[PDB]
Amino acid sequence: ADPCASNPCANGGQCLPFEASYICHCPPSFHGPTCRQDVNECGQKPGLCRHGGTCHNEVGSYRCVCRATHTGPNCERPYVPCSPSPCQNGGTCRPTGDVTHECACLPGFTGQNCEENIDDCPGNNCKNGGACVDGVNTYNCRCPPEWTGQYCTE
Amino acid sequence: ADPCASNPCANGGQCLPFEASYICHCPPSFHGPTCRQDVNECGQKPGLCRHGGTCHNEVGSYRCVCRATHTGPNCERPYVPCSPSPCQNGGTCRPTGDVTHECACLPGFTGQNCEENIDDCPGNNCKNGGACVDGVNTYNCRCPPEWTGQYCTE
Ligand SMILES: [Ca+2]
Ligand SMILES: [Ca+2]
Ligand SMILES: [Ca+2]
Ligand SMILES: [Ca+2]
């Protein structure tokens, strides 16, 4: 005799026997007789997304879409443009406003945040089937098993 | 026979014997026969203060006065307003521009960067010679040796 055998309480609801049937104790994220109805966290917890952010309800959670002036999962912290720095590949971040920034890239990279590595391979001198490998404003030839050299010619 | 006995080479210049006299080997910061003339680092090293900063020569060193857009001893890093945060006493920094900020103080503090602790002592109820001690939007009475209590009345 185990009415819970069937696993009726979903999404983490505890199942307990109750009279002829069972009974679900639901989690904070769901509700209903089986814990299969999503809780709208935005409506039950107003101001969940602080500092003017928009709350979007999800199934089993929610997400906050912050104003440009704030960040975090609930917009709790102000947005400081160059911390954490967005500029990848050792570029230099410079603030340009309250919510804006600008990246000064090292030679060899481009993009808004130094994200893309310029393809240095066109015009390479890798010979005898050696493959060209893009680098820090340069290239390297990966030679096949019967060649050595900077260009696979030795 | 020790011509250097007199300690003639100043500001860290090494003294060595040379002919009848001595001779000074000067440090980078000074020059002259005794290392007593200051070196003007600004003029001998141009661009010492990076990103448009002004170099002011000092005796035995120099100092850089940066543009608002940069910081460091030589203006090498850009200025990021809320990192390191200026707001003292657990206040919240909010950027308001490229080089400007604003602090949201916790209750009990005021000033541009939450620096001053509001004097909560006027109107205190510290009795029997007990001194008032300002606090986190509150006060405490430091009682004399024959009194106890929140107000020194027990
Ligand atoms: Ca939800
Ligand atoms: Ca490259
Ligand atoms: Ca100097
Ligand atoms: Ca106070």
Author numbering:
A (entry chain A), B (entry chain A): 141 to 294
Quoted passage from the original study:
Notch signaling requires cell-surface expression of a hetero-dimeric transmembrane Notch receptor, which has a large extracellular portion rich in epidermal growth factor (EGF)-like domains (36 in human Notch1 and Drosophila Notch).
We report a crystal structure of EGF4-7, where the domain interface formed between the non-Ca2+-binding domain, EGF6, and its preceding domain introduces a bent conformation to the region. Structures of two crystal forms (P21 and C2) were determined for hN1 EGF4-7 using X-ray crystallography. The EGF5-6 domain interface is stabilized in this orientation by packing of the side chain of A208 (with some contribution of T209) in EGF5 with V239 from EGF6. A second packing interaction is also evident between Y219 and P221 at the N terminus of EGF6. In solution, the EGF5-6 interface is also observed to be bent but is somewhat more open (70° ± 2°) than the crystal structures.
